[PDB]
């Protein structure tokens, strides 16, 4: 289409009007333009080519194959910065990727909380605020292979909220011990269980439990007695919220099997007073508690 100078003079710069006039006097209005399917001369988008883009066009004053300035008339005298910054926002960050501005600020508890929430539906806030994690066993194991000895880091950790909920987790990593602890912490939260506690301080009565080669003898204790038990049992009691306990481990004292045996004993070897009363159809009275009641 051929347009009158008035219209074309309201959209295009004066410097380009002469070129438009000459083109409208050399190309007949009835020109049937054909599309080339061998050579693509124009870009894949529409452009009047009246403005120089700061990025998609050559930089004015910069030397290059098609620079029209004389060699003594270039205007780039500083070379410490990139001449043509990226267009638009200034970045090419892929959709769904984040610029790594900050590194080393992650909390492994928050990483465990986010992953478990997505995988199991547990509340992240409870994991990151209510739970305490204590490593119990940290050793290196090795497998003999044809290539050679392959070492691995083994971590056994216990987590708990100090209010009845405790869990045991194990983790392995061939790379570093920190990765093994992360997996163990992850596993421990998934294994969280509630343990009955008498007066939220001790166990119900005494427990004689056999876990593989470990013989566990645990006795309930008076208020203010403290934890007088194997060190492995001490850590578990701390996380679980057991304050008063006495006990002795016989036969095997393997730390790993003491920890698992203890967790199992607290669940499979205890019976609440309420559960005993309902099963037998009898009333069970705590004499010490009644003595100080109204």
């Amino acid at each position: 289409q051929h347009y009158d100078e008035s219209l074309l003079s309201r959209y295009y710069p004066e410097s380009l009007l002469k070129s438009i006039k000459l083109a409208q006097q050399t190309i007949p209005e009835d020109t049937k333009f054909r599309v080339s399917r061998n050579v693509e001369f124009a870009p894949p988008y529409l452009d009047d080519f009246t403005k120089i883009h700061p990025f998609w066009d050559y930089k004015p004053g910069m030397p290059h194959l098609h620079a029209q300035e004389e060699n003594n008339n270039f205007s780039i005298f500083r070379w410490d910065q990139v001449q043509q910054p990226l267009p638009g926002e200034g970045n090419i960050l892929p959709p769904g990727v984040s610029l790594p501005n900050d590194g080393g600020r992650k909390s492994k508890s928050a990483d465990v909380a986010a992953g478990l929430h997505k995988q199991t539906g547990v509340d992240p806030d409870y994991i990151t605020r209510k739970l305490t994690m204590k490593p119990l066993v940290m050793k290196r194991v090795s497998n003999q292979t044809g290539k050679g000895k392959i070492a691995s880091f083994y971590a056994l950790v216990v987590v708990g909220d100090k209010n009845g909920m405790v869990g045991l987790g194990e983790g392995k990593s061939r790379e570093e011990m920190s990765k093994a602890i992360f997996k163990a912490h992850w596993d421990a939260v998934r294994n969280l269980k509630e343990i009955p506690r008498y007066e939220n301080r001790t166990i119900y009565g005494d427990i004689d439990f056999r876990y593989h080669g470990v013989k566990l003898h645990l006795r309930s204790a008076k208020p203010g007695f403290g934890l007088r038990v194997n060190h492995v049992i001490f850590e578990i009691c701390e996380c679980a919220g057991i304050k008063d306990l006495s006990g002795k481990v016989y036969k095997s004292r393997n730390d790993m099997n003491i920890a698992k045996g203890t967790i199992e004993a607290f669940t499979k070897a205890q019976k609440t007073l309420d559960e005993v009363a309902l099963g037998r159809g009898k009333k069970l009275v705590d004499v010490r508690k009644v003595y100080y009641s109204s």
């Binding site: 490593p135 050793k139 290196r140 090795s142 011990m177 920190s178 602890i181």
Partner: peptide, 20 residues
């Protein structure tokens, strides 16, 4: 001697990183 005792120092060192 190397394998068994090397980790005693590293696994305690892992605990050093925990406080860090």
């Amino acid at each position: 001697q190397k394998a068994r005792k090397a980790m005693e120092s590293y696994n305690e060192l892992e605990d050093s990183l925990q406080f860090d």
